Amino acid sequence: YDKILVLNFGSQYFHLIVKRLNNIKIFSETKDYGVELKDIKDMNIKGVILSGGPYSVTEAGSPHLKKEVFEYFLEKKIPIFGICYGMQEIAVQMNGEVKKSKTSEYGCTDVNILRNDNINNITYCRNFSSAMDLYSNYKLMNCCLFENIKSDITTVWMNHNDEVTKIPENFYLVSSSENCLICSIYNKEYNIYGVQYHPEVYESLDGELMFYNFAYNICKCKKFDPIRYHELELKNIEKYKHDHYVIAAMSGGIDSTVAAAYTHKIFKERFFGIFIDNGLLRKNEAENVYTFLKSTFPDMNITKIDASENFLSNLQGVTDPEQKRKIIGKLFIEEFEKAVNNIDIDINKTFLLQGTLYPDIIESKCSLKFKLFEPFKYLFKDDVKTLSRELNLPEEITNRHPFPGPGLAIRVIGEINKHKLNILREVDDIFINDLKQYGLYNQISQAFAVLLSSKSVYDYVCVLRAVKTSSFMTANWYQIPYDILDKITTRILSEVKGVNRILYDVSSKPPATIEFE
Amino acid sequence: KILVLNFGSQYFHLIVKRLNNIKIFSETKDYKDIKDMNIKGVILSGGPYSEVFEYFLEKKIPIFGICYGMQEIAVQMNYGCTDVNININNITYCAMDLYSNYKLMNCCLFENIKSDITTVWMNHNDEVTKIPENFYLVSSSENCLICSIYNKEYNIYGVQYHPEVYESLDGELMFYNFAYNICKCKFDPIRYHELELKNIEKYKHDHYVIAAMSGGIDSTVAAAYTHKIFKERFFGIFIDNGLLRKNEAENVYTFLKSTFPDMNITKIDASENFLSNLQGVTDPEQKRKIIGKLFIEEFEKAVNNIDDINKTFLLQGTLYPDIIESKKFKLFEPFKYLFKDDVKTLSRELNLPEEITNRHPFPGPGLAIRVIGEINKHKLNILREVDDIFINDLKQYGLYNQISQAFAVLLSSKSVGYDYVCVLRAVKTSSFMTANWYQIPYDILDKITTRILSEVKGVNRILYDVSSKPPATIEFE
Numbered sequence: 006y007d008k009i010l011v012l013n014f015g016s017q018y019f020h021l022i023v024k025r026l027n028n029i030k031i032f033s034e035t036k037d038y039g040v041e042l043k044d045i046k047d048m049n050i051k052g053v054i055l056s057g058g059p060y061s062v063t064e065a066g067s068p069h070l071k072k073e074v075f076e077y078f079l080e081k082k083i084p085i086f087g088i089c090y091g092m093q094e095i096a097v098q099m100n101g102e103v104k105k106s107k108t109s110e111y112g113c114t115d116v117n118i119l120r121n122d123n124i125n126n127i128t129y130c131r132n133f134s135s136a137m138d139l140y141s142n143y144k145l146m147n148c149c150l151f152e153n154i155k156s157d158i159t160t161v162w163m164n165h166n167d168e169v170t171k172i173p174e175n176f177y178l179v180s181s182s183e184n185c186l187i188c189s190i191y192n193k194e195y196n197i198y199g200v201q202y203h204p205e206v207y208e209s210l211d212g213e214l215m216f217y218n219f220a221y222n223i224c225k226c227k228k229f230d231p232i233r234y235h236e237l238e239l240k241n242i243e244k245y246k247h248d249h250y251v252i253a254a255m256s257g258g259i260d261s262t263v264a265a266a267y268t269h270k271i272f273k274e275r276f277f278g279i280f281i282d283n284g285l286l287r288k289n290e291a292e293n294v295y296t297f298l299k300s301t302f303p304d305m306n307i308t309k310i311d312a313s314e315n316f317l318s319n320l321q322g323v324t325d326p327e328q329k330r331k332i333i334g335k336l337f338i339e340e341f342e343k344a345v346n347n348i349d350i351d352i353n354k355t356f357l358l359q360g361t362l363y364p365d366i367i368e369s370k371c372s373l374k375f376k377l378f379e380p381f382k383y384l385f386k387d388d389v390k391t392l393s394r395e396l397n398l399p400e401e402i403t404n405r406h407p408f409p410g411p412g413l414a415i416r417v418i419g420e421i422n423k424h425k426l427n428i429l430r431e432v433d434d435i436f437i438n439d440l441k442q443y444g445l446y447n448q449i450s451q452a453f454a455v456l457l458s459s460k461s462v463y464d465y466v467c468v469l470r471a472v473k474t475s476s477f478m479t480a481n482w483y484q485i486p487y488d489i490l491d492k493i494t495t496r497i498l499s500e501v502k503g504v505n506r507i508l509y510d511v512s513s514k515p516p517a518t519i520e521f522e
Numbered sequence: 523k524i525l526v527l528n529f530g531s532q533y534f535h536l537i538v539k540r541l542n543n544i545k546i547f548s549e550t551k552d553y554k555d556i557k558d559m560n561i562k563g564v565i566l567s568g569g570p571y572s573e574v575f576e577y578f579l580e581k582k583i584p585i586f587g588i589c590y591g592m593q594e595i596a597v598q599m600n601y602g603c604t605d606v607n608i609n610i611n612n613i614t615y616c617a618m619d620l621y622s623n624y625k626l627m628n629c630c631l632f633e634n635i636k637s638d639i640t641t642v643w644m645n646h647n648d649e650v651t652k653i654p655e656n657f658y659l660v661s662s663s664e665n666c667l668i669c670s671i672y673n674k675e676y677n678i679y680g681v682q683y684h685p686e687v688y689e690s691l692d693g694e695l696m697f698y699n700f701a702y703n704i705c706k707c708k709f710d711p712i713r714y715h716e717l718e719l720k721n722i723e724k725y726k727h728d729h730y731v732i733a734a735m736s737g738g739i740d741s742t743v744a745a746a747y748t749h750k751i752f753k754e755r756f757f758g759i760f761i762d763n764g765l766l767r768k769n770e771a772e773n774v775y776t777f778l779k780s781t782f783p784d785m786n787i788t789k790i791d792a793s794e795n796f797l798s799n800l801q802g803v804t805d806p807e808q809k810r811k812i813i814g815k816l817f818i819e820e821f822e823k824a825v826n827n828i829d830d831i832n833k834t835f836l837l838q839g840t841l842y843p844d845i846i847e848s849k850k851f852k853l854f855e856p857f858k859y860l861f862k863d864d865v866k867t868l869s870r871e872l873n874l875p876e877e878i879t880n881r882h883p884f885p886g887p888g889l890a891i892r893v894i895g896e897i898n899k900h901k902l903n904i905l906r907e908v909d910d911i912f913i914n915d916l917k918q919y920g921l922y923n924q925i926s927q928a929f930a931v932l933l934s935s936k937s938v939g940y941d942y943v944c945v946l947r948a949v950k951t952s953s954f955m956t957a958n959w960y961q962i963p964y965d966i967l968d969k970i971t972t973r974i975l976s977e978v979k980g981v982n983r984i985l986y987d988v989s990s991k992p993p994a995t996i997e998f999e
């Protein structure tokens with residue numbers, strides 16, 4: 006109902022602002038910075054959040070809001086909230102100045118919220134001697150965004166190379182940082198707010214409060230519960246349960262399974278689960294998933310197709326990771342549609358179930374045809390995890406790491422064949438089993454083995470990958486205790502013939518990716 | 523002289539090193555021409571596999587078998603720090619019914635051991651189940667009953683453990699007991715170095731000396747001793763092959779001039795030659811073979827441009843490990859019976875800078891074997907940058923000195939951000955055939971990695987090598 010427009014400037018933390026709006030029961034409306042006025046004027050927008058980004062606002066080619074779009078916000082009285090890049094965009098839009106900092110900030114940092122009487126509480130005043138001499142050059146007050154904060158100091162997460170040097174228009178200086186004088190800014194007339202830090206990340210302790218103050222106190226929102234949308238959506242599909250069929254790609258992942266559970270309970274013998282073995286799964290995975298699905302849902306239709314030869318022969322000679330991805334996606338569609346036709350039902354009366362989550366719809370709005378059914382459009386991984394517990398599903402499905410569609414094709418670097426896959430399957434198996442045996446599996450977000458086309462003294466070189474993940478675009482490499490890692494690496498090199506070297510990935514995202522290819 | 527035959531043990535150099543500690547001359551050979559030599563005892567090494575045997579028993583040459591050697595001796599006669607027991611009532615694990623089946627002495631190899639318990643290093647998958655001939659059961663272990671065996675008739679000795687490594691506390695004493703008491707030996711390695719220099723001093727008036735200067739521990743201290751004698755007649759040559767690390771050619775040349783002011787050093791820039799010759803080459807062996815032939819070419823070309831080949835002697839810092847593995851000018855190698863541990867103390871005895879005594883070894887082919895696939899300037903530049911960051915930070919955080927060898931490696935494989943993939947390699951090395959991967963504190967490793975990914979363009983992923991030798995090697999290629 007009362008929606009906040011959240012605009013994308015390329016931030017690695019974009020999903021986290023959308024997440025915080027979900028936690029605070031406010032409807033998010035995700036769009037790129039280059040949005041046209043025509044696409045927003047007719048919507049019930051109560052406020053706009055401008056995200057951070059990896060760009061420098063000084064340079065050419067940098068993302069900017071169109072003059073008409075920004076002018077629309079001011080005229081319509083729509084409050085604005087800019088974080089990192091968003092703050093700097095606001096500055097640049099309104100007569101202000103932004104330059105590269107003398108000292109770049111990254112990590113947890115304490116910032117002093119400013120007030121006429123609070124001005125004395127700044128000891129680092131010499132970094133930009135008396136604190137009265139510095140803040141005489143700036144307008145202060147005696148700020149709604151920090152309501153009920155209690156303390157005059159707050160811990161926030163930093164990640165910026167540029168800083169506002171000269172305040173725009175008639176703005177108040179509202180917060181300062183040891184390495185950033187113009188840390189937060191406020192405009193009373195247009196309701197414009199700007200912070201250099203990232204309140205969307207967990208580490209920013211008072212973040213959820215600032216998003217709350219903006220949504221309700223500032224933007225005057227009245228409403229939307231994300232963990233209620235799927236229940237409402239399932240209660241309305243119930244009217245189709247006798248005249249319509251539901252088809253679903255079953256992968257063995259948490260998302261497809263939980264969705265199938267809630268939907269099978271409605272459509273029963275009219276629900277059809279399709280599990281396609283692409284020949285790119287892990288050791289015994291094709292058998293283990295199919296058994297798992299039958300043991301969990303005994304009365305459920307589950308068609309399994311061995312398509313291994315189809316994918317494998319089509320992947321011969323292919324080394325380019327995108328070419329791999331495009332072939333695998335193309336052949337999946339072809340095999341899936343072949344399985345749907347083999348059921349022999351009315352295509353004009355079928356629903357395609359997908360466990361599509363919010364991150365997916367956010368990502369989709371960036372840069373046989375079935376009536377789509379995605380109950381989980383507004384949910385996140387942690388929402389799906391607790392929903393699986395409410396179905397009393399085994400712990401194994403709730404804990405297990407995500408697995409990419411292209412599978413081991415993106416994990417065998419270069420030319421893919423059955424000889425390489427078998428070697429990787431052995432290494433990955435020993436790796437995963439041991440992480441479970443030493444009880445590390447559950448605290449790791451995603452762990453896997455990789456096989457390289459490069460060689461050492463001659464046999465193949467394997468890489469162990471393990472990460473802790475915050476969202477789609479941000480992850481840290483996992484620090485496996487050296488005693489356990491040694492036991493895992495020793496085991497692999499003696500058990501698996503064809504591998505003479507094990508490496509460990511020590512790169513976070515950014516700059517690296519979780520996967521290699 | 524003591525005979526020591528190689529059965530392919532990862533610890534073969536360590537048994538040789540222990541005989542060097544005891545001051546005994548070694549004659550290293552493979553698993554024949556031995557009748558002409560003065561052999562007073564034979565040692566049989568270990569091996570992962572798990573013959574003139576008659577001559578040993580006939581000539582009364584005592585045998586000493588370790589690990590595999592004990593087991594092979596048993597055949598011919600038909601893991602970690604563990605405490606073995608050398609008296610039968612002391613065996614706690616088992617009580618007296620078991621030892622009743624075996625013959626026990628009431629042993630020369632354990633003389634002056636004091637204690638009836640000893641700590642030894644284990645590394646074996648096979649064990650002797652039935653004793654050969656008329657052998658005594660001498661020692662036992664918790665996981666191995668038939669641990670040590672002895673034959674009085676032929677002076678045969680056999681131990682399951684590895685007394686050659688440091689972990690074996692009473693290792694040197696057992697080696698001493700075999701050599702001096704049993705074999706009745708009646709050659710100081712550090713002394714031979716000094717003796718070979720005094721003999722070469724008699725040729726200072728007419729002869730010359732030439733030495734290939736790398737900047738490594740071995741070639742510099744050899745030059746330090748020999749240049750002191752031959753002064754202006756000494757000619758040290760340094761060749762930049764374009765396979766060295768960032769600014770290393772400048773840094774080595776400056777260091778040598780600063781440490782040895784009166785030394786004649788000639789630097790030749792052969793980078794362009796080495797690179798072009800290596801264009802397209804990927805096979806690691808082919809790389810090495812090319813580099814060696816181009817080294818020799820450029821080396822003797824530089825000697826041609828300096829003033830009598832009939833008189834000149836070639837100084838080399840060849841060590842004992844180098845000589846053991848194998849089996850124009852007058853070749854002079856004074857360090858022929860020495861290890862790196864010995865050369866390091868010789869560096870200190872010269873009052874030389876701590877920089878060289880502590881610097882990690884650097885292979886002859888250089889970065890060529892640290893770049894996987896085709897070698898070119900673009901790849902070398904990136905590897906030089908990463909390596910320089912890695913090493914400098916390892917020195918900054920006080921890790922460099924406790925690490926035996928550390929370096930960066932560039933791979934031909936690529937990864938998304940599509941850029942090059944780097945690997946960090948750091949090991950602690952016991953001997954030539956044994957090294958363990960170093961466990962860099964995670965806090966420090968994350969600081970090094972973050973610095974590399976931010977500073978160096980062309981690299982978006984770095985990995986760490988968690989592989990030990992064996993089965994892996996120190997270098998990739």
Ligand SMILES: O=c1[nH]c(=O)c2[nH+]cn([C@@H]3O[C@H](COP(=O)(O)O)[C@@H](O)[C@H]3O)c2[nH]1
Nearest residue numbers: 330407408409410411451514518519520521
């Ligand atoms: O369904 C998928 N199809 C794909 O092509 C694909 N590529 C990466 N991933 C998964 O996405 C997450 C982020 O990985 P990257 O940082 O490597 O992009 C990680 O969880 C990856 O496992 C994929 N999932």
Ligand SMILES: O=c1[nH]c(=O)c2[nH+]cn([C@@H]3O[C@H](COP(=O)(O)O)[C@@H](O)[C@H]3O)c2[nH]1
Nearest residue numbers: 810883884885886887927991995996997998
């Ligand atoms: O002078 C050299 N020329 C070479 O071709 C060569 N290959 C390996 N190495 C060095 O030898 C040690 C053990 O090497 P590996 O464990 O890689 O076999 C390590 O210290 C390596 O640096 C070389 N040194």
Ligand SMILES: [Ca+2]
Nearest residue numbers: 346347348349
């Ligand atoms: Ca049909």
